[PDB]
Amino acid sequence: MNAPDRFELFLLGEGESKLKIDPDTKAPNAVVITFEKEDHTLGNLIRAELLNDRKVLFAAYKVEHPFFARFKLRIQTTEGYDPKDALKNACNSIINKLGALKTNFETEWNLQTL
Amino acid sequence: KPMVNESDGVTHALYPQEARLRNLTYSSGLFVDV
C-alpha cells in the first residue's frame, strides 16, 4: 500500500536537481549540498575523499531519514578556497583513484586463469 | 453411510469435499424398526 514505488531510490522527480547547494549560515565559508537519490554508496565515499583535502576543514554527511534516498553533505574550506571546488578536487581524486583500481584489477585479472 | 437427498437426483453419493464445497450437511441417515 503506502509504500513508495521502488524506483524512487535513484530516479529523480519533477524538477529535482540531483545536487542542491545551500550556504551554511552558521559557520562562514561552508556549504551544505543536498544529494538527491543517493546513499552511503556515495555519501561516505565523498566525505572520506574530502577529509584528505589538506585545505578542507569540515566534512560530514547525514542520511536525513532511511525512507528518503537523500543525504546532506556539509563542506568547509580555508578562506577563499571555494568549497564547491573542494568537492570537485575530491571527486576527481576518487574517480582517478577508481580508474586506477579498474586497470590494476583488469591486468592482474587478465593474468590468472583457473 | 452419509448421503444427501437433493431436489431431483434423489440419492446423491455425498462425500465430505462434496458437501464442503456445495454447502451441504455431512448427514448420515436414521432408520429403525417400529
Partner: protein, 43 residues
Amino acid sequence: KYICAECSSKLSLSRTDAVRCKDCGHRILLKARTKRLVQFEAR
C-alpha cells in the same frame, strides 16, 4: 465456459440448462480463465 472436478473435462455449456455435469453425475462446475492475458510484475 464452466468445468468439473472429478471428470476434469471441458463441459462448458451456456446458462439456464440444468447445473449438472455431462456424463459424470456430480455438480462440481468451475469457470475457467478468461482468454484475457493478465499481466504480472516479476516481484
